Amino acid sequence: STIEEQAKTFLDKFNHEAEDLFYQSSLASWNYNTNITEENVQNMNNAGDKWSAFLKEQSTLAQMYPLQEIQNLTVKLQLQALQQNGSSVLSEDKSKRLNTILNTMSTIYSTGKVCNPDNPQECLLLEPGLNEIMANSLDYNERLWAWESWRSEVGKQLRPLYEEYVVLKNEMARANHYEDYGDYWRGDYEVNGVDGYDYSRGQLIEDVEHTFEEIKPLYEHLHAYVRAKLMNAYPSYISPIGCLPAHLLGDMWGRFWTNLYSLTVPFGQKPNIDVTDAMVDQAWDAQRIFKEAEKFFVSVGLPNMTQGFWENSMLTDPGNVQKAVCHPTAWDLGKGDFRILMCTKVTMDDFLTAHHEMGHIQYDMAYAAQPFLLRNGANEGFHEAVGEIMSLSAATPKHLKSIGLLSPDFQEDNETEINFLLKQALTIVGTLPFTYMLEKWRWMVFKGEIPKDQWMKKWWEMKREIVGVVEPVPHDETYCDPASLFHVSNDYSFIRYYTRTLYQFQFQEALCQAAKHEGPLHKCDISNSTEAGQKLFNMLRLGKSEPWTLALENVVGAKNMNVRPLLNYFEPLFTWLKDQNKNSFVGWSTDWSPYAD
Amino acid sequence: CPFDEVFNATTFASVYAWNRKRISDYSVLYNFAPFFAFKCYGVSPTKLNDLCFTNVYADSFVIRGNEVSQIAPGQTGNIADYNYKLPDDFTGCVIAWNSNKLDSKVGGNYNYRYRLFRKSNLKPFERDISTEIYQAGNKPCNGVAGVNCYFPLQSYGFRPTYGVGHQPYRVVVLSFELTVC
Ligand SMILES: *[C@@H]1O[C@H](CO)[C@@H](O[C@@H]2O[C@H](CO)[C@@H](O)[C@H](O)[C@H]2NC(C)=O)[C@H](O)[C@H]1NC(C)=O
Ligand SMILES: *[C@@H]1O[C@H](CO)[C@@H](O[C@@H]2O[C@H](CO)[C@@H](O)[C@H](O)[C@H]2NC(C)=O)[C@H](O)[C@H]1NC(C)=O
Ligand SMILES: *[C@@H]1O[C@H](CO)[C@@H](O[C@@H]2O[C@H](CO)[C@@H](O)[C@H](O)[C@H]2NC(C)=O)[C@H](O)[C@H]1NC(C)=O
Ligand SMILES: *[C@@H]1O[C@H](CO)[C@@H](O[C@@H]2O[C@H](CO)[C@@H](O)[C@H](O)[C@H]2NC(C)=O)[C@H](O)[C@H]1NC(C)=O
Ligand SMILES: *[C@@H]1O[C@H](CO)[C@@H](O[C@@H]2O[C@H](CO)[C@@H](O)[C@H](O)[C@H]2NC(C)=O)[C@H](O)[C@H]1NC(C)=O
Ligand SMILES: *[C@@H]1O[C@H](CO)[C@@H](O[C@@H]2O[C@H](CO)[C@@H](O)[C@H](O)[C@H]2NC(C)=O)[C@H](O)[C@H]1NC(C)=O
Ligand SMILES: *[C@@H]1O[C@H](CO)[C@@H](O)[C@H](O)[C@H]1NC(C)=O
Numbered sequence: 001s002t003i004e005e006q007a008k009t010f011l012d013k014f015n016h017e018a019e020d021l022f023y024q025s026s027l028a029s030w031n032y033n034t035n036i037t038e039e040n041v042q043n044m045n046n047a048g049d050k051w052s053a054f055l056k057e058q059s060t061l062a063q064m065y066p067l068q069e070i071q072n073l074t075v076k077l078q079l080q081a082l083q084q085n086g087s088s089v090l091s092e093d094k095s096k097r098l099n100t101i102l103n104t105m106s107t108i109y110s111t112g113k114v115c116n117p118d119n120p121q122e123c124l125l126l127e128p129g130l131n132e133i134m135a136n137s138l139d140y141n142e143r144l145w146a147w148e149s150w151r152s153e154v155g156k157q158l159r160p161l162y163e164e165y166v167v168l169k170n171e172m173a174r175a176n177h178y179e180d181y182g183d184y185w186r187g188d189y190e191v192n193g194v195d196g197y198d199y200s201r202g203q204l205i206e207d208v209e210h211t212f213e214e215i216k217p218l219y220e221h222l223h224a225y226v227r228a229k230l231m232n233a234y235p236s237y238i239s240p241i242g243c244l245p246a247h248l249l250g251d252m253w254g255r256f257w258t259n260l261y262s263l264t265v266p267f268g269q270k271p272n273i274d275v276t277d278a279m280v281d282q283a284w285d286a287q288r289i290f291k292e293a294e295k296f297f298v299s300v301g302l303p304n305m306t307q308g309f310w311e312n313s314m315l316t317d318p319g320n321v322q323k324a325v326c327h328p329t330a331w332d333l334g335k336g337d338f339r340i341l342m343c344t345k346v347t348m349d350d351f352l353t354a355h356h357e358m359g360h361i362q363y364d365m366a367y368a369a370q371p372f373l374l375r376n377g378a379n380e381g382f383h384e385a386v387g388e389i390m391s392l393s394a395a396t397p398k399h400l401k402s403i404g405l406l407s408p409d410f411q412e413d414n415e416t417e418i419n420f421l422l423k424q425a426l427t428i429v430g431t432l433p434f435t436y437m438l439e440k441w442r443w444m445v446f447k448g449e450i451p452k453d454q455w456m457k458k459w460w461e462m463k464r465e466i467v468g469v470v471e472p473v474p475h476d477e478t479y480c481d482p483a484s485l486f487h488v489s490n491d492y493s494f495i496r497y498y499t500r501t502l503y504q505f506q507f508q509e510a511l512c513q514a515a516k517h518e519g520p521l522h523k524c525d526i527s528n529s530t531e532a533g534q535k536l537f538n539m540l541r542l543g544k545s546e547p548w549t550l551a552l553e554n555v556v557g558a559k560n561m562n563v564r565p566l567l568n569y570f571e572p573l574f575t576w577l578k579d580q581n582k583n584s585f586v587g588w589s590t591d592w593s594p595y596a597d
Numbered sequence: 598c599p600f601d602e603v604f605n606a607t608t609f610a611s612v613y614a615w616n617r618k619r620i621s622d623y624s625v626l627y628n629f630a631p632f633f634a635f636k637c638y639g640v641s642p643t644k645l646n647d648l649c650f651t652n653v654y655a656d657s658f659v660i661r662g663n664e665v666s667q668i669a670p671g672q673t674g675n676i677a678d679y680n681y682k683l684p685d686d687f688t689g690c691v692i693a694w695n696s697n698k699l700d701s702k703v704g705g706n707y708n709y710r711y712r713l714f715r716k717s718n719l720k721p722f723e724r725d726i727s728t729e730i731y732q733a734g735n736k737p738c739n740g741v742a743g744v745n746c747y748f749p750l751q752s753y754g755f756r757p758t759y760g761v762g763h764q765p766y767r768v769v770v771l772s773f774e775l776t777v778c
Contacts, residue, residue: 001734001735006733006734006745009714009733009745009747010733010745012713013747013751016713016751020754023754023756027758061744064744306760306761307761308758308759308760308761312758335754335759335760335763336759336760336761336762336763337758337759337760338760
């Protein structure tokens, strides 16, 4: 009759009804995503609204049990995940205003239009054309026009909305005892009451700042190399001791440097390994790819596919008229129903995306025995790390030469090694400073340390000091440059893309030692080893039942995220870069600007 | 013995109220079908033709796939404590098979109604069909739903696009007592 025993009684009924309603909602959403019609939209909206209403009613019902008298840890976790008010703690007018400005920001970002100065009836949206000009063009003036106009004709509409969204979200977050909206975001990595694995919401800042303090020696050399290579495609525009103009980086924002590969390739006469001709040579189809992926997965000690995965999944694009949004994803409809939705062609990118998606499917199959509220990764940075280590270890030459896609001998040299390592560095290391800087800016904005008359100044000061890029045109306090990013205007967190990159290589080095690898880390293959599978399964099957600082120790041996595995992975490229910059100047000065002349 | 009825009825009962038919040629059941599970406990499965008893009973129901392992002497769970409890001195022999193609309709089959709340654990070979409201807290609810008072039936949501372990599995539990031979 105590206050603890009634919690379990409530949780049982909640679990059952929630499983049922969630399955109905997910089935409706899938039937819409694979077959676009008009009545499917309403048939999906009905189930979605029913599920949301049930969730809201159970949430407002669960407030009767005080989280202080609970003794079990699983019950306490489930209650605390259910008791959270979230939004709707505000008034009604404020909630309507918040939803309106959120939808307005999303719409402004989605359908923003810019057009030419000399032919004003030639307007281009963002996705079909702006991030294509910024991706393939090699003209300085055209890239500058695109980068300036996107921020001058769309970013200027998002500032008076962001200035209100900040205050509204800060109020909503202070209504739940969080001191700001940034602490509400960092509250995901919190762990309390375990006696040995505690983790405050304020230690994430220090951990991030201490793990970024050791990537600077490598990012500096990569920056110097990319600068010395860019001083040849746009002569007399880059200075040998200055930063890089922000429009010569590869895309609209500079998040990924991966489009600079055609300019900064180390050895341009050795083609990187790309087995696409052999697949069409042996006539591989959309099903042999997934058979090979499943074979690789079962090789390490993980179960087969559930046999309900083959008939219900959509592995090929439906032909006649079945307009379908096929963005490769893995579904978890529940009750033992797993499906995959993707438009597979016969290439190598699909051959790796199959492994990436089946990684998510295996993770979902792992923890399917936990209660309903505990079916997720340990935190927001485990799912993608697990899904990425598979595609990391499945694209090696040693693995490709055993399936049959490569010639039997195929001696490997060090030039292609450096080519591959550098192509990997432009995507892995080229985004960590950007992510860290953006999330630091957002934390300082929400916390209240950057008054609303010093937003752009501080943004560009930090972009000059941390990332190492400079703007080509002065931006006063009417612009809002971060708001022109998808994750900033659509209200998504951004610290997961930083911790995922560390967890990925931590897991890879932890598994390389159970498989007893010998050479460098970027030649690892975990296949044909039942120790790596066992170590990984000791963590996959936990879900959110345990604190993440314990699920991490059960694999790597430490509690906090580390940065040594990443440097151990990039060691050879590091030495080569350190010997290619004997004459250049490693570093930058924050005074040179492309307009100060 | 008319085994053609207890194995082939067009509609099987539910777990909380299982149909018990008494009997006043086992080579027809042993040699017939896939039979996903077939375990005989007191008597060896092969010599079922030389030892006979006073009467046999054939209970039946429809439970979920991953709960078949609970129909056994000395088990615990939402099925073996509240709906159907087999004594530790069992002598009969359990059988169960998959029936996904018959007892599952697209859109949900809400006629199978396992019970999940009860004041005490069931005794061996008892049946409880009462439908009173379970009182969780300390304040009586006088037979109405609300807070800390729930409806003790939680009908299965059967569908064809489920996974093995969530599909319907018919069950028959022959139990002997010592005639028919
Ligand atoms: C895609 O959805 C449309 C409509 O939502 C389906 O079109 C009809 O659906 C009804 C539903 O019972 C069927 O009776 C009709 O036969 C369907 N028309 C045709 C021309 O097939 C359509 O079948 C769906 N596609 C798939 C592959 O399920
Ligand atoms: C309350 O806590 C106990 C132990 O602190 C949990 O007992 C576990 O229960 C699961 C399944 O019910 C078993 O697999 C474990 O072996 C049990 N552990 C121990 C140490 O006995 C119990 O599950 C908790 N309550 C709930 C609702 O989860
Ligand atoms: C969640 O929101 C409710 C309001 O909707 C907060 O207020 C408490 O609600 C309970 C439930 O009826 C009342 O019994 C209390 O008197 C309310 N005031 C309190 C507790 O000061 C509730 O505090 C919120 N809880 C959380 C964890 O956000
Ligand atoms: C790849 O390896 C070869 C040898 O295995 C390297 O060639 C030697 O490089 C050193 C260092 O510059 C020279 O002192 C030797 O004279 C070279 N030997 C020959 C036969 O050329 C080559 O430099 C390596 N390439 C990279 C990119 O590391
Ligand atoms: C995993 O191990 C198996 C067996 O040890 C390998 O399968 C054999 O590989 C050799 C190497 O060419 C072939 O000659 C045999 O014909 C293979 N046997 C079978 C039954 O296929 C497999 O290649 C290994 N996989 C990896 C990635 O190392
Ligand atoms: C269960 O009943 C069905 C139908 O009553 C039986 O199906 C019959 O199968 C025989 C062949 O063995 C056919 O000649 C009949 O036409 C079928 N009847 C119908 C209506 O389908 C089935 O044999 C029975 N199974 C058992 C185990 O007795
Ligand atoms: C997986 O399925 C294949 C058949 O395609 C079978 O040969 C193999 O034994 C199965 N492995 C496991 C672990 O179930």
